[PDB]
Write a protein that binds this ligand. Structure first.
Ligand SMILES: NC(=O)c1ccc[n+]([C@@H]2O[C@H](COP(=O)([O-])OP(=O)(O)OC[C@H]3O[C@@H](n4cnc5c(N)ncnc54)[C@H](OP(=O)(O)O)[C@@H]3O)[C@@H](O)[C@H]2O)c1
Ligand SMILES: NC(=O)c1ccc[n+]([C@@H]2O[C@H](COP(=O)([O-])OP(=O)(O)OC[C@H]3O[C@@H](n4cnc5c(N)ncnc54)[C@H](OP(=O)(O)O)[C@@H]3O)[C@@H](O)[C@H]2O)c1
Lengths: 352, 351
């Protein structure tokens, strides 16, 4: 059997700036064999779900000095985190029928020649799409960023930006259940309302309807901020610095306001870091897979007990992957942006 | 027994911008009685040596919200670290003839009503002026900053801004002795040459003669920088971040480039901290006086063994303190800036 294998390719490198749909092209003509090559040590996946993640945009720009991940290649499939089902395997740790998450192609079938970076899914009763976010890379990021990087203590005053996002909605709930006071910023009233009801944040505000971020942070933090879970950067970062307490911490998870800027914004008040003895620390979840067992143990139990809430934004079909990715930098995604490529056989779960 | 007590007063608060000599006045008519008051709990000092330190500038500006340290007060003496001799004492832990360091008045005699701020000097064989710098607040800064905040490991690559300055000349040596590759930036060819001969830095450069700081750092760090001891801020930091290695650390000691500017400059590449997993951390020596005893011991041994070098810029006389202080922000000080207010009798040789 040879079968159809649609793909989304990167049409070309793009300059600093925003990505556009037309930087990527769907190809419907491709095909694939349903067995791994003889002599291989490899896994063929049927791909089921794809994650759209903000870090993916930077990969659409050529870098001369190797960054932490390899750039995409013009004319090759876009790649990113997703979930697949093993169709065939010449690697002993993977059997036909296993479900796995890892870096896979923006396509219907991916032949993975380095299986070692696939994670076998051990909990298939949990909806599989969760392994693209909360139980995948995104959730581990929340966990490492909050519990390790932030050094939290009960009672501390915590601010999360992009707080209705995939990372931030998780962070908020961890902080809350840790016994912290928690405030989030988000880009719409719908998000704000989700933060205050569904996610149990103490307060939230719509950053786009604030003419002054410093004063706004001052409203919700009359004694200032202990901990900032930084997802955005820009002027929001300056506003936090101004409102930060002595021995405050900032876990620099990301800086999404800067990713599509020809010209990144200046941060002006870093000297506050001296007199306030602030630690500003970046981290990359790719260094922390060693933590996964402790994390998955904690998060699977929370999910199975309904003591954490999670919101996915689902888009149906490979074809809609590119726009969904672009949507992230406009804040179109409401929750964690997933793309269904093909739903696994015998699903029977309802939705609205 | 009343005597003359000359003082250097803050004339007035100053706005955003650069301080100058004339923001201070020397007054010569005042006098003081050489005993502490009965029932007092105090220590009367004859002040010997005074430190000029960069943080002093910020104290000349009014702050409606409280910085780490009180603003100076117009009409009242300038204060700062120094070294003093106890003339009279109504506080148990201090006796007549003892030597101490701590915050004292810019004047000839200071009656200290908060004696718990003072530290007795236990090595009087070392020149007492050392306790305004290498053995005082300045040395402890270097030691906390490097040994604790920078988390150093044998064989890492270290860059120091204001490297010929007091803090930075100590940092560089601590680092070289820790087995690190060390480079420093300074604002003169003379300072650059001191960093390489006297202070054992591996390389150094005149920031003022580099049109591209990013490229300059790349010349000296072909595989990037592990540790940046940050005394300067601004475009230099930006340049550092561009050249910093995976899991780099920046100990934010201070950002002197920013202290006399109406508009502080913007850092544009802070996002690199995520992708390179950089820790940037401010510290204040004020929080770390618990480390003093062990630090003192360590640096005393280095001095005894001649395993560390130290250069002081010495000015003679209180009247010369104001210029001395201003010089700091122009980089006129060559070494740790000291003012001798009065020498203790019985003495080392200088040139
Ligand atoms: N360090 C790591 O290992 C690591 C791992 C995963 C993610 N990250 C980072 O973590 C952050 C969150 O990613 P996610 O996966 O949780 O994405 P997300 O929050 O699910 O989606 C991105 C969101 O960013 C917000 N946004 C976009 N442009 C913005 C701007 N110019 N100003 C302010 N907000 C803006 C939008 O929310 P609003 O409607 O509220 O604007 C959008 O919904 C990102 O910066 C990402 O790069 C880092
Ligand atoms: N965090 C803390 O607790 C703590 C404690 C003590 C000191 N500090 C900080 O550590 C730093 C060094 O202090 P120090 O006592 O050792 O001072 P210092 O280096 O003895 O003297 C200040 C030096 O700063 C340099 N400089 C002045 N203006 C500059 C500018 N615009 N750009 C670049 N460099 C400039 C000059 O040297 P060049 O010839 O090298 O330009 C000058 O010699 C300061 O930023 C200070 O505020 C922090």
């Amino acid at each position: 059997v040879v079968v159809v294998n649609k793909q989304v390719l990167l049409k070309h490198f793009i300059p600093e700036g925003a990505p556009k749909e037309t930087d990527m092209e769907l190809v419907t003509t491709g095909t694939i064999r349903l067995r791994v090559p003889e002599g291989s040590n490899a896994v063929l996946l049927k791909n089921l779900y794809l994650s759209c993640d903000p870090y993916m945009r930077m990969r659409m720009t050529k870098h001369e000095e190797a960054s932490y991940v390899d750039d995409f290649v013009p004319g090759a499939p876009i790649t990113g985190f997703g979930v697949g089902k093993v169709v065939d395997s010449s690697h002993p740790d993977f059997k036909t029928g296993d479900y796995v998450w890892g870096l896979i192609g923006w396509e219907e079938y991916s032949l993975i020649t380095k299986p070692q970076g696939l994670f076998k899914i051990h909990h298939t009763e949990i909806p599989l799409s969760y392994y693209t976010g909360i139980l995948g890379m995104v959730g581990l990021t929340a966990y490492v960023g909050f519990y390790d990087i932030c050094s939290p203590k009960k009672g501390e005053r915590v601010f999360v930006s992009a707080a209705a996002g995939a990372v931030g909605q998780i962070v908020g709930q961890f902080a809350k259940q840790f016994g912290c006071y928690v405030v989030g910023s988000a880009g719409s009233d719908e998000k704000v309302n989700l933060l205050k009801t569904k996610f149990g944040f103490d307060e939230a505000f719509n950053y786009k309807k604030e003419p002054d971020l410093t004063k706004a942070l001052k409203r919700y933090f009359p004694e200032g901020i202990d901990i900032y879970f930084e997802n955005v950067g820009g002027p929001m970062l300056e506003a936090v610095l101004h409102n930060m307490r002595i021995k405050g911490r900032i876990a620099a998870c990301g800086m999404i306001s800067q990713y599509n800027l020809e010209k990144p914004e200046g941060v002006h008040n870093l000297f506050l870091i001296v007199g306030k003895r602030i630690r500003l620390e970046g981290f990359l979840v790719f260094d922390h897979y060693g933590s996964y067992p402790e994390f998955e143990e904690k998060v699977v139990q929370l999910i199975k007990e309904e003591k954490i809430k999670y919101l996915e934004d689902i888009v149906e079909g490979l074809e809609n992957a590119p726009a969904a990715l672009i949507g992230l930098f406009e804040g179109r995604n409401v929750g964690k942006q997933v793309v269904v490529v093909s739903r696994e056989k015998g699903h029977h779960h309802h939705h609205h």
